[PDB]
Design a protein around this nucleic acid. Structure first.
Length: 56
DNA sequence: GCGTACGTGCGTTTAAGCGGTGCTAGAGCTGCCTACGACCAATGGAGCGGCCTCGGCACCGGGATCCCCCAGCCGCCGGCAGCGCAGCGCCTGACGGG
């Protein structure tokens, strides 16, 4: 269900692990179930520390 | 280099701590009865294997942003150098005193 919504955003009809890793990581609750599992070819969540960004 | 706030110390003070009750709740165990899960023999069809064909995605090529950059550009202002000047203390007059 969470994965399917992600596939909608990228518009691909076929579900893909990149969706799966993305889906199960945004939900903080489901995150706790798999806090020590790594998905094949999952890729990290898109995140950047604010300080790294330019001052303005 | 600044400065505050947290360590050190002192002086209350109070609730922890001790020792003492007194209770019954609840855990531990036993006796005994039941049902429910394992076991066994059959059965078929759900699932798994083997093909096998379209199109979702990949890939390309092109056009479309769009942030990223920065000199242009001006405003601003303050510093700065020059200029006009305001005030004062002395300089020096006006006029009586020495």
């Amino acid at each position: 269900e969470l994965a399917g919504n992600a596939a909608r955003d990228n518009k691909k009809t076929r579900i893909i692990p990149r969706h799966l890793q993305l889906a199960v990581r945004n939900d903080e609750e489901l995150n706790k179930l798999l806090g020590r599992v790594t998905i094949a070819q999952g890729g990290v969540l898109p995140n950047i520390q604010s300080v790294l960004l330019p001052k303005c």
